[PDB]
Amino acid sequence: MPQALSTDILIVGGGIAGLWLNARLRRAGYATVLVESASLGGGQSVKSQGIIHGGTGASEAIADMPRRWRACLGSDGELDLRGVRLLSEAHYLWSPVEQAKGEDLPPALRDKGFKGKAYRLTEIVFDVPDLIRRLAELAGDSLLAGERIEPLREGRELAGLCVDGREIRAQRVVLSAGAGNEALLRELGLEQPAMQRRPLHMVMVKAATLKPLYAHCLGAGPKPRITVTTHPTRDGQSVWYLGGDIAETDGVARDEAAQIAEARRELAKLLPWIDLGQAQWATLRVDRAEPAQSNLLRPDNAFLAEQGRLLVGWPTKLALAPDFADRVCARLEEDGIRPSEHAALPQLPRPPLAEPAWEVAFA
Ligand SMILES: Cc1cc2nc3c(=O)[nH]c(=O)nc-3n(C[C@H](O)[C@H](O)[C@H](O)COP(=O)(O)OP(=O)(O)OC[C@H]3O[C@@H](n4cnc5c(N)ncnc54)[C@H](O)[C@@H]3O)c2cc1C
Ligand SMILES: [Hg+2]
């Protein structure tokens, strides 16, 4: 028998949404346990491009995100993320806000061959592994590696969970397990809220010759043709990580070589002044985990649902993790749930941190 535990809020899943919420709750005086079955940040989060989007009824929530995340890096934000690494102070639009010129242009667009125009946004780009590291620090002793989860009932009521045979009692249980939310819901005998999986086929290029770039390339059409972010590697090279429309439906249908070949064509057109002849190339397939369209959604918002003492959801964007936290805290607030008194947590087995794919795919 492992030592039984007691807290206020028990969170399942240590990606950005669970970790951010955990940090908010602890800051507000709640006791928590956060349960992760693999590595923290290791589903979608560390695989994101790290861009904090900010672009109004439903669309209000997203618009305020860059300001909110920025605040956290200083003295007066909703979390203490001071000393978290930004990859870039700005993300850019790139066409054929501020119009950027001369040495205000991103390094990769300073070339004389750069025709067309770039626009600087308030949007920010975070080093996600370093973000996750800090949120794990803010978690303190709440963090628990646990693989196998069962419900802990009191009649029909959900009193907590049994994690690797350990009973953990809690006033609420929150499922922030990404793609794992579906099977956890089934484990509780639930089928709502339903989940969808929208795959991406992301491309990574690694070379010594790359110059920093954080941008959506627009042709015609609302959506980015490609989305570039630059990621430094431990050995002193960089990696350009490519999302956008190249990583969507037709990218998904292309195999690795066809997807790489498509990526080479497009970089030769858009950034011909950067020699990729010595570059290494890889791709990455990953599913976005979202509420199904069959749920009651507001689009540019986090999604949350509940059944009894169970709260469950998805941020939809990494950007919107603070909105996911707000939605949980307003339920707690409306329901009158306050911090109670609990024994200190013992020593617990701790989940590992995830590495970014650019360190694993080449190194
Ligand atoms: C390629 C890509 C690029 C993206 N780029 C951006 C971007 O630039 N900007 C932006 O705002 N958003 C972006 N997103 C969206 C963003 O990544 C997600 O919305 C967000 O990271 C999801 O956070 P999460 O914590 O809900 O999910 P996850 O990060 O998937 O975390 C879920 C966690 O739960 C754990 N878990 C699963 N099952 C169980 C279980 N049974 N028991 C215990 N733990 C479990 C997992 O191991 C995982 O760590 C991107 C997504 C992808 C796929
Ligand atoms: Hg472009």
Numbering used by the authors: 1 to 55, 65 to 105, 125 to 391
Paper quotes:
Locus PA4991 had been annotated to encode a flavin-binding protein of 391 amino acids. Analysis of the structure of PA4991 identifies this enzyme as a member of the GR2 family of flavoenzymes. The function of this essential enzyme in the virulence and survival of P. aeruginosa in the host nevertheless remains elusive.
The structure of PA4991 was eventually solved by a combination of molecular replacement using a truncated search model generated from the sequence of PA4991 with Rosetta and phase improvement using a low-occupancy heavy-metal derivative obtained by soaking crystals with phenylmercuric chloride. The refined model of PA4991 consists of one polypeptide chain comprising residues 1–391, one FAD molecule, 41 water molecules and two Hg2+ ions bound on opposite sides of the thiol group of Cys245, albeit with low occupancy. Three loop regions, residues 55–67, 106–125 and 248–249, lacked electron density and appeared to be disordered in the crystal, and therefore were not modelled. FAD is bound noncovalently to PA4991 in an extended conformation in a manner similar to that observed in other members of the GR2 family. The ADP moiety of FAD binds to the classic nucleotide-binding fold, including the diphosphate-binding fingerprint motif GxGxxG, which in PA4991 is represented by the sequence Gly13-Gly14-Gly15-Ile16-Ala17-Gly18 at the end of strand β2 in the central β-sheet of the domain. The isoalloxazine ring is located in an accessible pocket with the re face of FAD facing the solvent. Accessibility of the cofactor in PA4991 appears in part to be controlled by the loop comprising residues 54–67, which is disordered in PA4991. In the vicinity of the isoalloxazine ring there are the side chains of His53, Arg316 and Lys345 that potentially could be involved in ligand binding and/or catalysis. Enzymatic assays did not support a function as a G3P dehydrogenase/oxidase or an amino-acid oxidase as hypothesized based on the three-dimensional structure. The conservation of the active-site arginine residue involved in the binding of negatively charged groups of the substrate in these enzymes suggests that the unknown substrate of PA4991 might also carry a negatively charged phosphate or carboxyl group.
